[PDB]
Amino acid sequence: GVDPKHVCVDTRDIPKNAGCFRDDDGTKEWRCLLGYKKGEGNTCVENNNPTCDINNGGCDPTASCQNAESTENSKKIICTCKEPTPNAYYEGVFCSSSS
């Protein structure tokens, strides 16, 4: 999709168990770590059953997800950043302007 160059600067909107990201829009985003999900309320927690498509399984829409099962929720879903992607934050929960 788009180029991760979105970087991140402030990310105060960014809850716990959530990685920090900024979008091209200027809006600072957050996502829920690999195999995580929103639990608290605008917040991320360990999702003991991660599925792809939904939260991308805790991955970034540019990061190609894989839906899988494992003892660890954060060792289930696989995210893939590519050449057209400056970075992959939190293993690929996001993609930023490299790191």
Curated annotation (Swiss-Prot):
Potential candidate for the development of parasite blood stage vaccines. In vitro, neutralizing antibodies against the p19 subunit are capable of inhibiting parasite growth in host erythrocytes. The gene is MSP1. Residues 6-48, 49-97 form the EGF-like domain. Disulfide bonds join 8-20, 32-44, 52-65, 59-79, 81-95. This is p19 subunit. A lipid is attached at residue 96 (GPI-anchor amidated serine). Glycans are attached at residue 25.
